[PDB]
Amino acid sequence: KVFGRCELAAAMKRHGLDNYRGYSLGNWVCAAKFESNFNTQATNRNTDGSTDYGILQINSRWWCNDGRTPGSRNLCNIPCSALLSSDITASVNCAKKIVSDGNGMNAWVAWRNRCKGTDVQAWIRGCRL
Ligand SMILES: [Cl-]
Ligand SMILES: [Cl-]
Ligand SMILES: [Cl-]
Ligand SMILES: [Cl-]
Ligand SMILES: [Cl-]
Ligand SMILES: [Cl-]
Ligand SMILES: [Cl-]
Ligand SMILES: [Cl-]
Ligand code: NA
Ligand code: NA
Ligand code: NA
Ligand code: NA
């Protein structure tokens, strides 16, 4: 599913991401924009053989099981395929664990490089939330 900008903002708010760990909704929408262009089915292979999945490009090294990432963990206790669902529940629940891990949203290098420090509220501007 490719979400619209305000549609994803609303879904993320519904699932409790707005101000989760102190990160405003626009942070999350911005990160989703640059990780996946709002596409739940986005996948990206990493040089290390891990793969990133879904709207927030969650990695198989630590967070989900895909059966093809040697030596990896599955800390969200999910098949990586759940991260590709039109239902963002599994992505959101897993993102909550990731952002709680110590480094906040810096875990998403695209967030650090493209969203951090910017006018992230622009990402929810105009939306009925
Ligand atoms: Cl957009
Ligand atoms: Cl915001
Ligand atoms: Cl497996
Ligand atoms: Cl594996
Ligand atoms: Cl594990
Ligand atoms: Cl599994
Ligand atoms: Cl949803
Ligand atoms: Cl933080
Ligand atoms: Na994701
Ligand atoms: Na894994
Ligand atoms: Na999901
Ligand atoms: Na950018």
XYZ file of N, CA and C and ligand atoms in Angstrom:
399
model
N 0.884 -1.214 0.000
C 0.000 0.000 0.000
C 0.896 1.231 0.000
N 0.608 2.188 -0.893
C 1.267 3.477 -0.810
C 0.321 4.444 -0.115
N 0.706 4.886 1.090
C -0.114 5.818 1.853
C 0.052 7.211 1.268
N -1.011 8.018 1.413
C -0.887 9.462 1.339
C -0.250 10.023 2.610
N 0.333 11.214 2.485
C 1.027 11.857 3.589
C 0.121 11.999 4.818
N -1.054 12.631 4.662
C -1.918 12.829 5.821
C -2.542 11.505 6.272
N -2.805 10.599 5.333
C -3.346 9.293 5.660
C -2.377 8.541 6.575
N -1.070 8.582 6.254
C -0.102 7.912 7.126
C 0.037 8.619 8.476
N 0.060 9.951 8.469
C 0.094 10.680 9.729
C -1.046 10.209 10.631
N -2.262 10.124 10.072
C -3.405 9.715 10.883
C -3.247 8.287 11.409
N -2.730 7.370 10.572
C -2.549 5.986 10.967
C -1.506 5.912 12.079
N -0.419 6.689 11.927
C 0.635 6.652 12.937
C 0.127 7.182 14.285
N -0.727 8.213 14.232
C -1.276 8.803 15.447
C -2.214 7.806 16.128
N -3.033 7.127 15.327
C -3.968 6.126 15.816
C -3.210 5.034 16.574
N -2.018 4.655 16.073
C -1.241 3.583 16.684
C -0.280 4.091 17.761
N -0.410 5.359 18.154
C 0.298 5.880 19.318
C 1.742 6.322 19.068
N 2.102 6.654 17.820
C 3.478 7.088 17.557
C 3.675 8.579 17.821
N 2.580 9.343 17.835
C 2.703 10.783 17.968
C 3.264 11.132 19.348
N 4.450 11.748 19.340
C 5.225 12.072 20.530
C 5.740 10.841 21.287
N 5.784 9.664 20.637
C 6.393 8.493 21.255
C 7.887 8.737 21.505
N 8.333 8.509 22.753
C 9.719 8.763 23.138
C 10.072 10.222 22.843
N 9.058 11.101 22.810
C 9.265 12.530 22.609
C 9.413 12.935 21.141
N 9.166 12.005 20.206
C 9.314 12.363 18.799
C 7.952 12.702 18.208
N 7.788 13.972 17.798
C 6.526 14.444 17.239
C 6.180 13.650 15.979
N 4.881 13.644 15.645
C 4.360 12.926 14.488
C 5.116 13.286 13.206
N 5.462 14.565 12.999
C 6.169 14.952 11.777
C 7.528 14.260 11.615
N 8.211 13.962 12.741
C 9.455 13.191 12.690
C 9.233 11.823 12.040
N 8.156 11.168 12.450
C 7.833 9.823 11.991
C 7.415 9.842 10.529
N 6.610 10.848 10.161
C 6.167 10.973 8.776
C 7.361 11.274 7.860
N 8.250 12.173 8.310
C 9.457 12.503 7.557
C 10.305 11.241 7.350
N 10.519 10.484 8.434
C 11.347 9.292 8.333
C 10.717 8.328 7.332
N 9.391 8.151 7.400
C 8.732 7.239 6.467
C 8.898 7.715 5.023
N 8.769 9.026 4.810
C 8.932 9.583 3.465
C 10.261 9.148 2.854
N 11.356 9.324 3.608
C 12.664 9.117 3.010
C 13.103 7.654 3.111
N 12.503 6.891 4.023
C 12.839 5.470 4.046
C 12.127 4.731 2.906
N 10.832 5.023 2.677
C 10.012 4.163 1.826
C 9.167 4.911 0.804
N 9.187 6.251 0.828
C 8.225 7.026 0.038
C 6.781 6.587 0.329
N 6.534 6.186 1.584
C 5.226 5.869 2.137
C 4.694 4.534 1.599
N 5.578 3.678 1.076
C 5.163 2.414 0.477
C 5.421 1.274 1.462
N 4.366 0.579 1.909
C 4.528 -0.496 2.881
C 5.338 -1.642 2.282
N 5.359 -1.767 0.954
C 6.009 -2.941 0.376
C 7.479 -2.705 0.034
N 8.036 -1.545 0.409
C 9.439 -1.236 0.147
C 10.360 -2.275 0.801
N 11.380 -2.713 0.050
C 12.432 -3.564 0.588
C 13.767 -3.050 0.054
N 14.852 -3.214 0.829
C 16.178 -2.784 0.395
C 17.209 -3.750 0.958
N 18.046 -4.355 0.095
C 19.110 -5.265 0.501
C 20.330 -4.451 0.933
N 20.926 -4.808 2.082
C 22.128 -4.143 2.573
C 23.360 -4.954 2.190
N 24.516 -4.283 2.127
C 25.781 -4.910 1.774
C 26.083 -6.109 2.679
N 25.644 -6.036 3.943
C 25.907 -7.042 4.967
C 24.980 -8.247 4.814
N 24.082 -8.198 3.828
C 23.180 -9.310 3.576
C 21.855 -9.210 4.341
N 21.739 -8.246 5.278
C 20.457 -7.985 5.920
C 19.556 -7.264 4.919
N 18.255 -7.199 5.234
C 17.313 -6.493 4.373
C 16.472 -5.570 5.252
N 16.094 -4.409 4.699
C 15.202 -3.456 5.346
C 13.791 -3.616 4.771
N 12.767 -3.500 5.644
C 11.383 -3.790 5.316
C 10.396 -2.700 5.784
N 9.585 -2.340 4.768
C 8.335 -1.652 5.042
C 8.484 -0.129 5.111
N 7.453 0.521 5.661
C 7.370 1.963 5.627
C 8.513 2.558 6.431
N 9.018 1.819 7.465
C 10.126 2.480 8.152
C 11.456 1.722 7.953
N 11.498 0.830 6.950
C 12.730 0.168 6.523
C 13.463 -0.444 7.726
N 12.730 -1.294 8.448
C 13.221 -1.981 9.630
C 14.065 -3.173 9.203
N 15.253 -3.319 9.835
C 16.325 -4.192 9.381
C 16.232 -5.585 10.021
N 16.607 -6.627 9.259
C 16.532 -8.020 9.690
C 17.713 -8.427 10.576
N 18.727 -7.569 10.724
C 19.896 -7.899 11.533
C 19.480 -8.038 12.997
N 18.599 -7.135 13.449
C 18.193 -7.113 14.842
C 16.712 -7.393 15.051
N 15.840 -7.004 14.103
C 14.475 -6.688 14.511
C 13.426 -7.682 14.029
N 13.683 -8.377 12.914
C 12.677 -9.279 12.375
C 13.373 -10.506 11.787
N 12.597 -11.595 11.626
C 13.145 -12.813 11.042
C 12.763 -12.927 9.568
N 13.782 -13.077 8.700
C 13.547 -13.352 7.283
C 14.223 -14.658 6.848
N 14.896 -15.339 7.778
C 15.444 -16.649 7.476
C 16.713 -16.614 6.636
N 17.213 -15.425 6.273
C 18.332 -15.327 5.346
C 19.334 -14.279 5.826
N 19.359 -14.003 7.139
C 20.322 -13.034 7.644
C 21.184 -13.731 8.699
N 22.290 -14.417 8.328
C 23.063 -15.179 9.311
C 23.464 -14.405 10.563
N 23.210 -15.033 11.718
C 23.687 -14.537 12.994
C 22.766 -13.461 13.553
N 21.621 -13.240 12.895
C 20.726 -12.142 13.239
C 19.801 -12.493 14.400
N 19.141 -11.458 14.924
C 18.120 -11.569 15.941
C 16.774 -11.152 15.348
N 15.728 -11.348 16.165
C 14.353 -11.059 15.802
C 13.687 -10.414 17.014
N 14.164 -9.215 17.392
C 13.766 -8.653 18.681
C 12.314 -8.194 18.700
N 11.704 -7.947 17.529
C 10.298 -7.587 17.491
C 9.402 -8.829 17.466
N 10.013 -10.016 17.353
C 9.292 -11.292 17.346
C 8.267 -11.378 16.220
N 8.700 -11.056 14.999
C 7.828 -11.047 13.839
C 8.602 -11.544 12.624
N 7.893 -12.148 11.656
C 8.476 -12.366 10.328
C 8.584 -10.999 9.651
N 9.696 -10.792 8.924
C 9.894 -9.475 8.311
C 8.741 -9.153 7.354
N 8.146 -10.198 6.759
C 6.981 -10.007 5.905
C 5.841 -9.200 6.556
N 5.609 -9.284 7.871
C 4.557 -8.500 8.551
C 4.739 -6.970 8.426
N 6.007 -6.650 8.118
C 6.361 -5.246 7.996
C 5.966 -4.709 6.623
N 5.410 -5.575 5.757
C 5.084 -5.162 4.394
C 3.569 -5.028 4.231
N 2.834 -5.328 5.300
C 1.376 -5.331 5.312
C 0.793 -3.940 5.022
N -0.409 -3.900 4.431
C -1.148 -2.641 4.358
C -1.508 -2.100 5.754
N -1.535 -2.995 6.746
C -1.673 -2.723 8.172
C -0.291 -2.450 8.814
N -0.237 -1.170 9.257
C 1.029 -0.652 9.753
C 1.267 -1.075 11.197
N 0.351 -1.841 11.815
C 0.481 -2.186 13.232
C 1.866 -2.768 13.541
N 2.299 -3.771 12.760
C 3.549 -4.450 13.055
C 4.693 -3.479 12.805
N 4.642 -2.745 11.651
C 5.691 -1.694 11.632
C 5.777 -0.744 12.867
N 4.642 -0.248 13.354
C 4.637 0.737 14.436
C 5.150 0.126 15.740
N 4.616 -1.045 16.115
C 5.027 -1.703 17.343
C 6.538 -1.949 17.343
N 7.070 -2.349 16.173
C 8.497 -2.621 16.089
C 9.297 -1.313 16.181
N 8.834 -0.254 15.491
C 9.479 1.053 15.587
C 9.516 1.559 17.037
N 8.479 1.273 17.833
C 8.509 1.706 19.229
C 9.666 1.044 19.980
N 9.905 -0.255 19.737
C 11.021 -0.930 20.373
C 12.345 -0.350 19.870
N 12.429 -0.073 18.564
C 13.683 0.417 17.998
C 14.036 1.779 18.601
N 13.047 2.672 18.661
C 13.335 4.034 19.103
C 13.629 4.090 20.601
N 13.302 3.003 21.313
C 13.540 2.869 22.745
C 14.932 2.289 23.033
N 15.710 1.961 21.991
C 16.903 1.123 22.127
C 18.101 1.895 22.686
N 18.019 3.229 22.784
C 19.159 4.003 23.285
C 19.480 5.256 22.458
N 19.406 5.150 21.117
C 19.847 6.223 20.232
C 18.671 6.968 19.621
N 17.470 6.709 20.140
C 16.331 7.450 19.638
C 16.190 7.211 18.135
N 15.764 8.245 17.425
C 15.494 8.083 16.003
C 16.777 8.068 15.167
N 17.940 8.270 15.799
C 19.202 8.125 15.089
C 19.383 6.703 14.547
N 18.613 5.736 15.075
C 18.649 4.373 14.549
C 18.337 4.374 13.060
N 17.505 5.333 12.610
C 17.210 5.485 11.199
C 18.178 6.507 10.614
N 19.182 6.028 9.875
C 20.176 6.967 9.381
C 19.534 8.006 8.455
N 18.493 7.651 7.683
C 17.812 8.642 6.853
C 17.138 9.721 7.696
N 16.592 9.348 8.865
C 16.064 10.378 9.759
C 17.162 11.356 10.195
N 18.304 10.836 10.642
C 19.395 11.694 11.083
C 19.841 12.608 9.939
N 19.947 12.053 8.728
C 20.535 12.807 7.622
C 19.534 13.753 6.953
N 18.220 13.458 7.030
C 17.283 14.223 6.207
C 16.152 14.884 6.998
N 15.956 14.483 8.255
C 14.802 14.955 9.008
C 15.254 15.701 10.262
N 16.227 15.129 10.983
C 16.720 15.685 12.238
C 17.042 17.167 12.075
N 16.463 17.991 12.956
C 16.826 19.404 12.991
C 16.036 20.259 11.998
N 15.218 19.623 11.142
C 14.490 20.329 10.090
C 13.090 20.689 10.585
N 12.343 21.428 9.755
C 10.991 21.798 10.120
C 10.058 20.615 9.870
N 10.116 19.605 10.750
C 9.403 18.357 10.500
C 7.883 18.553 10.575
N 7.428 19.608 11.270
C 5.991 19.834 11.362
C 5.383 20.059 9.975
N 6.205 20.456 9.006
C 5.712 20.620 7.636
C 5.054 19.326 7.135
N 5.524 18.187 7.643
C 5.043 16.888 7.169
C 3.598 16.594 7.598
N 3.069 17.302 8.628
C 1.702 17.060 9.077
C 0.832 18.298 8.846
N 1.427 19.339 8.257
C 0.725 20.596 7.993
C -0.427 20.340 7.033
N -1.602 20.877 7.385
C -2.770 20.761 6.534
C -3.624 19.538 6.864
N -3.070 18.565 7.595
C -3.774 17.303 7.805
C -4.813 17.422 8.923
N -5.972 16.782 8.735
C -6.957 16.676 9.802
C -6.520 15.555 10.742
N -6.028 15.917 11.931
C -5.484 14.932 12.851
C -6.098 15.113 14.237
Cl 4.753 13.807 0.225
Cl 5.496 17.506 14.037
Cl 12.573 -18.542 8.669
Cl 18.004 -15.357 9.666
Cl 15.881 -12.844 18.920
Cl 9.257 -15.843 11.461
Cl -2.947 0.891 9.276
Cl 15.816 10.568 22.297
Na 8.775 -0.683 8.345
Na 16.679 -11.443 11.919
Na 3.186 -3.709 9.505
Na 16.471 15.308 2.139
